[PDB]
Symmetry: C2
Subunit: 48 residues, 2 copies
């Protein structure tokens, strides 16, 4: 591994990775949440 490294902070968990799609007029981002993650992020319940 290189001895040099950046701080590599994690993405804000609702927007995820930014796309660098070439001809884009404005930036866009995507995330997948697994069944394990969803119950950790969706911290409120309505009627269960």
């Amino acid at each position: 591994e290189p001895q040099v490294s950046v701080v590599a902070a994690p993405p804000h968990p609702l927007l995820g990775t930014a796309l660098d799609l070439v001809d884009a007029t404005g930036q866009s981002f995507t995330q997948q949440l697994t069944p394990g993650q969803v119950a950790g992020v969706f911290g409120q319940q309505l009627y269960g």
Copy 2:
């Protein structure tokens, strides 16, 4: 597991994954090739 009927063919190796950016006017795709894959796909050498 769900019923195994879910499975489908792999992506064409350098065309990769089709995106679904919502308001896109025509489809786009991306691939990452890691170094061991690069030597597998780039089957010609010029001057080494």
